């Protein structure tokens, strides 16, 4: 002669944290922080470009290992560890400011500079560091300018690139730094060298550094690279008596793409919006504990491993 009331219960409950207790036992709960990572770059429905052994800056200069990737259109650009950019010893002035600019870009278009050289200039400078086909070569987009004969002073030559396109072109050039005073006089001459670059927004002078250095790739001499962007209708004029690594082609970035720095293998079976150094993150929930550094539409990083959100009521055993 009685009617009773009560809730449902389970044998094994799930522990959750509350404002009053961190040992609360609810009937059922779910996870909110992702721990699962796919060690693959999910590239389905995505026109990706792997670089393999090429480093982004090599695309603009023409490194032998980066010869494949000198042009293309993409929405995503993948970069690897140990990626070579400089065949011949050296670096680029603010190279990171340039590298992430390429990883933000969605394609590279190449345009000729149209540079004519005199009789006293050997525009066919090569090195054993840059190898193509098997023999010696040079950076694809650049030209090493030396004296035609030993000793003879490099002539004061004026080279001008002009813009015609509606967009802005990124021009690169290098400065050679000889390994000894005796070697310096062979390449350009005994005379004092000065490389002056002039435009409408950029003016800077460079003097070739000469001195003894350790051997890199089998060389003591080094070439450092410089870069600037020229506006539409704007001209860039070079004035030098040797030492300048001339530009044969200028670079032009098409659109906007995504830049991934991961060593993980590629996969076209899955698709992802979130990437890190160890692969892809595919999840609906808003937290992850994999890495603080990610790219794209991503869950926010948290220091905790597990955080359980309760879906059911208090679990009271029988």
């Amino acid at each position: 002669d009685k009617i009773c009331l009560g809730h449902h219960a389970v044998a094994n409950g799930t522990i959750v944290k509350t404002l009053t207790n961190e040992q609360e036992e609810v009937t059922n709960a779910t996870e909110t922080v992702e721990s699962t990572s796919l060690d693959r770059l999910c590239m389905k429905g995505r026109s990706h470009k792997d670089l393999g052994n090429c480093h982004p800056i090599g695309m603009l200069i023409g490194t032998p290992a980066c010869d494949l990737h000198l042009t293309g259109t993409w929405d995503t650009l993948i970069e690897r560890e140990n990626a070579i950019a400089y065949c011949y010893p050296g670096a680029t002035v603010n190279e990171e400011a340039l590298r992430q600019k390429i990883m933000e870009s969605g394609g590279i278009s190449k345009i000729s500079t149209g540079f004519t050289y005199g009789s006293s200039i050997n525009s066919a400078g090569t090195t054993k560091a840059c190898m193509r086909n098997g023999g010696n070569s040079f950076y694809a987009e650049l030209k090493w300018l030396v004296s035609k004969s030993k000793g003879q002073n490099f002539p004061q030559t004026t080279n001008t690139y002009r813009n015609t396109d509606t967009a802005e072109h990124l021009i690169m050039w290098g400065i050679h730094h000889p390994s000894s005073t005796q070697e310096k006089n062979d390449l350009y001459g005994t005379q004092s060298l000065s490389i002056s670059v002039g435009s409408s927004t950029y003016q800077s002078n460079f003097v070739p550094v000469v001195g003894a250095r350790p051997q890199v790739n089998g060389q003591s001499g080094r070439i450092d690279f410089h870069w600037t962007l020229v506006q539409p209708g704007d001209n860039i004029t070079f004035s030098h008596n040797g030492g300048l690594i001339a530009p044969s082609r200028v670079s032009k970035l098409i659109g906007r793409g995504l830049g991934i720095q991961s060593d993980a293998p590629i996969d076209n079976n899955c698709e992802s919006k979130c990437f890190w150094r160890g692969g892809s993150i595919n999840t609906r929930l808003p937290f992850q504990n994999l890495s603080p550094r990610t790219v794209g539409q991503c869950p926010k990083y948290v220091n905790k491993k597990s955080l359980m959100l309760a879906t059911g009521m208090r679990n009271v055993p029988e």
Binding site: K2, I3, L5, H8, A9, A11, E96, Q297, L309
Partner: protein
């Protein structure tokens, strides 16, 4: 709890209750009984679903790598980024532990309320034909058959039928 029904006056839940979240365990002359309630269960389910709905609502915020992975970055900006990232991390880590704990507290108490709201729905329906047990039951002072207890659960129970019968049983 807050509403003091779940783990409150009711000792425990039923591990046999598989067809629902809240139910009845009635005993009469015919025998035993066990049937769950729709409204109470669904009110608890509908609210958790919409609580889970906000969670998976993904932000369309596009981030790009400001910290280089393989190459080196300038040491001073390299400290600024490391500081800002760790400060952002601290916000989202504490914020996460807050949300989880806050939503955990409210849900448990929400599920506690719909239990009490059902108990109050039965107490008012039985009017003066039944008295309160103390452990979450109702002492029915009239002969209530198997179709009679169903009329409570169907929300069709009329106290006017058993008013004269129960009142006299309560007073001898």
């Amino acid at each position: 709890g807050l509403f003091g029904a779940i783990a409150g006056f009711i000792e425990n839940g039923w591990e046999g209750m598989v067809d629902g979240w809240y139910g009845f365990r009635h005993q009469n002359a015919q025998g035993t009984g066990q049937a769950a309630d729709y409204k109470s269960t669904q009110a608890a389910i509908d609210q958790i679903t919409g609580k889970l709905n906000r969670l998976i609502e993904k932000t369309n915020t596009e981030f790009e790598s400001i910290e280089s992975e393989f190459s080196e970055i300038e040491h001073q900006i390299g400290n600024v980024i490391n500081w800002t990232k760790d400060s952002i991390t601290d916000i989202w880590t504490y914020q996460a532990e807050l949300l989880v704990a806050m939503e955990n507290q409210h849900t448990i108490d929400m599920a506690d309320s719909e239990m009490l709201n059902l108990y109050e729905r039965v107490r008012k329906q039985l009017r003066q034909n039944a008295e309160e047990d103390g452990k979450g039951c109702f002492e029915i002072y009239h002969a209530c058959d198997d179709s009679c207890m169903e009329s409570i659960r169907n929300n069709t129970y009329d106290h006017s039928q058993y008013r004269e019968e129960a009142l006299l049983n309560r007073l001898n």
